[PDB]
Amino acid sequence: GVLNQVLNDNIRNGHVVNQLMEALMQLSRQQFPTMPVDYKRSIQRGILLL
């Protein structure tokens, strides 16, 4: 008898941050094509800390 805003099943068992990992791991291989090089490796290693 009480409406309560509930999450979906893919966050409650934690499976979605496996999908973020594969989204964030391929974000750390792509060459940032016009970015300076010392700002590229500081933003790819900052991804690999997550």
Partner: protein, 98 residues
């Protein structure tokens, strides 16, 4: 297999000439990309390109081609385009021994 980082000043015309011997013996995979490029471009804009009278290159930050790999195509000599081919393809040869 540390990566060295080159440290120099642009206003020393002899340290840039002695850097020509350094890149042609040590393979460029060891010198770090943010500091190999700033030394590989300083030889181009000071020693190589004023020698031929060409216009000094507009090298933007973060171009995927290092400025020796972009000055073996833009130069028209044969003997200084044969050394710039060795520096662009100087690599370690990973072989397994014993």
């Amino acid at each position: 297999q540390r990566t060295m980082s080159l440290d120099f000043v642009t206003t020393n015309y002899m340290s840039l000439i002695s850097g020509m011997w350094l890149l042609t013996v040590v393979p460029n995979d060891m010198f770090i990309r943010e500091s190999l490029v700033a030394c590989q471009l300083a030889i181009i804009n000071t020693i190589i390109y004023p020698a031929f009278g060409m216009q000094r290159m507009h090298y933007r930050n973060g171009d995927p081609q290092t400025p020796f790999q972009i000055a073996e195509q833009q130069i028209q000599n044969f003997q200084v385009a044969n050394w710039l081919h060795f520096v662009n393809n100087n690599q370690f040869r990973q072989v397994v021994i014993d």
